[PDB]
Subunit: 342 residues, 4 copies
């Protein structure tokens, strides 16, 4: 029927490889013709196992050489602004993973380049908005079935088994810290659910569970309490040392009923009875938890390019969530309350 979109991908790591698989196997109206990474094994895997034509170690070279309509940026956070700016100037439609970046000026310039190319689609990586459970809860809230929102609590905690791959991820490039890396999703959800902005942050951090993270300037746990512009209160917890699995939980406490999303991170529909009692095995990664969400958001992006429609989640939503996460980290660093400026 219609000519499929020609696409390229930067990054083939923890999330990169999942996006690449979906891009080849699951996404309609797209052909992944080029891949870029600094790891030679990942590039060989992209070529031989996935059937991607051309591989690159230089992303600028790829954009300069390849005939592509859209690009997927799944490289580390510090590279996001420069990679996006380069692709936007080349005339490309951009899907960039969260966060937008780390430096405020680098993000602002990125935002300026995006706004100057309105004919090109820019989409961020807040996948939890596409997840069926979060949507279902949002629909309940929008219906008035829990009254007015009083309080929201967000958990985002990786399991102990993920300490090796996170360390590599954080050693090789700045992640922005626990609040920026873990809590940013929850920050967007709170903004989405309430329609309000945080005006004050109290952040506390911890290395009790993993003291060796101090060596690389990381905190194992980040706990933040937020005050919103409308009176709603919030707690955010990011962590890396859960024993059961990947905990991703959102609690929305209303004036007339509550909802809890992902109270237990159940793997499947199987209840196990053993010498421990009654067990529910848990999901061990964010990727297995949000696999469908990752697929649906990317399909949405491809559809956005074809139709010529910008995503509901704006650049400003990415900036605001980043500034808030930074504020929580600032609060912990300085040991003071931080009034959020947006």
């Amino acid at each position: 029927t219609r000519k499929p979109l020609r696409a390229a991908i930067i990054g083939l790591g923890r999330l990169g490889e999942r996006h690449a698989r979906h891009l080849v196997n699951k996404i309609q109206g797209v052909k992944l013709v080029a891949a870029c990474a600094l790891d030679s094994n990942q590039l060989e895997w992209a070529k031989n196992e996935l059937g991607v034509e051309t591989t690159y170690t230089n992303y600028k070279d790829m954009i300069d050489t390849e005939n592509i309509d859209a690009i997927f940026i799944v490289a580390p956070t510090p590279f996001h602004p420069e990679m996006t700016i380069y692709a936007m100037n080349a005339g490309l439609n951009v899907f960039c993973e969260k966060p937008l970046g780390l430096d405020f000026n680098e993000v602002d310039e990125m935002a300026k380049v995006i706004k100057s190319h309105p004919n090109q689609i820019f989409q961020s990586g807040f996948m939890r908005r596409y997840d069926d459970s979060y949507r279902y809860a949002k629909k309940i809230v929008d219906n008035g079935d829990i009254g007015k929102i009083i309080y929201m609590r967000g958990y985002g905690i990786d399991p102990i088994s993920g300490m090796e791959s996170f360390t590599k991820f954080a050693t090789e490039a700045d992640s922005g810290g626990i609040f920026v890396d873990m809590n940013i999703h929850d920050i967007d959800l709170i903004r989405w659910f309430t329609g309000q902005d945080p005006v004050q942050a109290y952040g506390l951090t911890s290395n009790i569970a993993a003291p060796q993270l101090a060596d690389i300037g990381e905190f194992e746990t980040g706990v933040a309490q937020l005050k919103m512009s409308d009176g709603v209160i919030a707690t955010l917890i990011g962590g890396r040392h859960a024993a059961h699995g990947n905990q991703v939980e959102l609690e929305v406490m209303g004036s007339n009923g509550w909802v809890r999303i992902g109270e237990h991170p159940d793997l499947n529909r199987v209840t196990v009875f053993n010498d421990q009692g009654v067990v529910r095995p848990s999901l061990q990664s964010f990727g297995e938890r949000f696999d469908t969400a990752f697929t649906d958001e990317v399909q949405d992006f491809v559809n956005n390019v074809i139709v010529g429609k910008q995503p509901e989640v704006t650049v400003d939503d990415g900036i605001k969530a980043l500034k808030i996460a930074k504020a929580c980290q600032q609060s912990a660093n300085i040991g003071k309350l931080v009034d959020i400026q947006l």
Copy 2:
């Protein structure tokens, strides 16, 4: 204020010791004066730990020597009829544990002796009727909150840790088989909930989990299906080899809703997170599960003796439950459907 009832107990085993503890510590308007057991150490325990005045190895000696208003028979099932008859004839009020007996001839004579002493209270031991949860579900059903009952499922499975204490219990005396020992409780519950009687039984037995039980003529598992007098269908499962704990479960499946009682045998209100996932520790015995019900039923008996009122659960209820149980056992042994007449 008023003279307490003077009571005695026969048997201080798995259930006897719990009854004796409640009788000294929890039950009001009663004083445990004497105890009878064949175990010397159990009798010493009654004197030294509980403060019981006198001890006996012969129950007839105790009944003919002690000044008592009431007796508690927690001796093995075969001794129930002869102990009840002797105690009834001595003017005593009798609380006898379930079941009434094993031989239909012995139980008939026992029932006749109880009928001939209408001024003396007799009470069986179907404690589940006193349990808070079963009562709650019975109220739900009676209010019509599940519509009309169509199906019921009763599970009564001991944990693997109880295998040693059961073998002791079943080698020293005839327990009456798995359907009589385990499933009798659910039979009573089904009769209670429906107001109907079973007309047909299909029973099947298993020694897969423990083949050594055949050496004492016992079956590890007994599964029975029942046709009720007004349409209802029921399944009963008695077992002795669960890994998680003591499973005691009742499902009432209606035309406009269901209820499940004790779907999981949760020990307490603690949820555990470990390398297994999300865990709920389980109850390990019938005595821990039904501790309150055991207390409440004995208190009801004591009140019944004082006020001069026969309990709701009649002798007829015990006979029928025993008959239906033995019909399930017969069905399994003869490999045929058994039509029940009550």
Copy 3:
């Protein structure tokens, strides 16, 4: 080179299968569609881009250039459609059950057996379900010891009653055991590696007394004796208030597993005046959607690679004979010995 495929039937499950074929399945193109409904065919042509539509399935097989056919028409037509396609060289995916008439199913199996270069696959999708596979891996590893007892539930929500009544008046459903429990029967055989030797069936119409007029039963409860000493219970029903209950309990000598104990819709827990609430799934389609996609993908891959599926025609016959033995037991009011 993608497979050229046709579909017969665009109903409750037919529309779902056709969607997957177009949107999710790799190595295939849905070239043609056949149904008796004009609206369903227009939906297939407009919304799914199906090139050609037919009311006559035989005319479709004889006109279209196709490699595979998906049979999602009513059960009675399964044998003759499978037979016609097999004799025309096609690869066949046929939905459960194989059929109702034992002779037609034997004739059906004969046509399958005489075309060994052609793939035939049935629709036991629960074997592809992530949860069932997980439990099957647990049992195989010896994590629950030996199986002693299994319990299978298949109960539809009240909302489906008015839908089912209209269908069961005009057509033969095969009965409550055949319709609601055949999946559970296959699962028991799969998990145990053994066959039922005896069956006790009971039926009920307490929840829907109006079904007695159309020779149907609202509830069927069956107790089964396995060849190795394992005991099973099957329940089929049509009057659950909470939603679609599909449950398997596998009781072992050293551990139990339960599959779909509660038919949880998603990961949202609700707190309201009723207490603490988990919303439930309302149809088999929503529950086993991924399974429906995976089995169909498996079939496509089987045709391409030229490999017959694990589940045989014999598996489909046996599960049907077992289900019918349960219905017979209830109807004659007697124990039925199975072989």
Copy 4:
């Protein structure tokens, strides 16, 4: 030989303590009762068999032959009722909290210390609860590793709003943190062995704007920095739809425990048009009935043997200070340092 006992207060909790004293507690006789309500006093004399009833507690103490007294009167009377009883050479069980005014509690604590032959026990019943003790056992054994974070919830159902509104118009509750989270603070102090050094509190009246008219807050949320690096959250509330939520999460370095994640009424699972439902507890009393019994039994035992309870007066004072810091933090819109 039983201890002769009296009770002051027969309201929401007093009525419960009185019943346990008569029906369940061993080694104690409830001889006298004092309240400002005729109906309550008459209920004590008729349904419980209490000999003498009073409307003045001073008259009761000065007349009755008693060894112990239970103070379940309103909080403003706690300091003066304890001092009056301690001076009378009496063993005192006093409900939470010790008081609302720091000067009155300071004087109260000084009197308690000067009578060391008399037992003083407070009302932190959660330390007697089976579930909290089981979780405390896990934490102590090192079965969750090192504590990193803890979260305490105490939320009353909407049904309880009416009785609270009329009460808080009449008397000072001490604020949402003092009234709803004091148990949780003690629990955190008990589980960690550490003390908070800093508090950030925020309040809300979104659910009940009418409470701002009487200087009350419907919801309070606090974050606490503990002295050795542990982080904690406290939430008190009065507008839950499902029932009484009382929950404690202990997040560790190698495992977590959650106590009372759902406030389950019993062991019954309900299946209806809304899905799978667990009915919830509606009050703190029904949730902690056994805890109330066991602590009062422990007090009686303490008086018999002559052993002071593990929970000290400094525990009740510290917990109160911490809760007040949370309230103050919200009221002034600033962080509060705690010493």
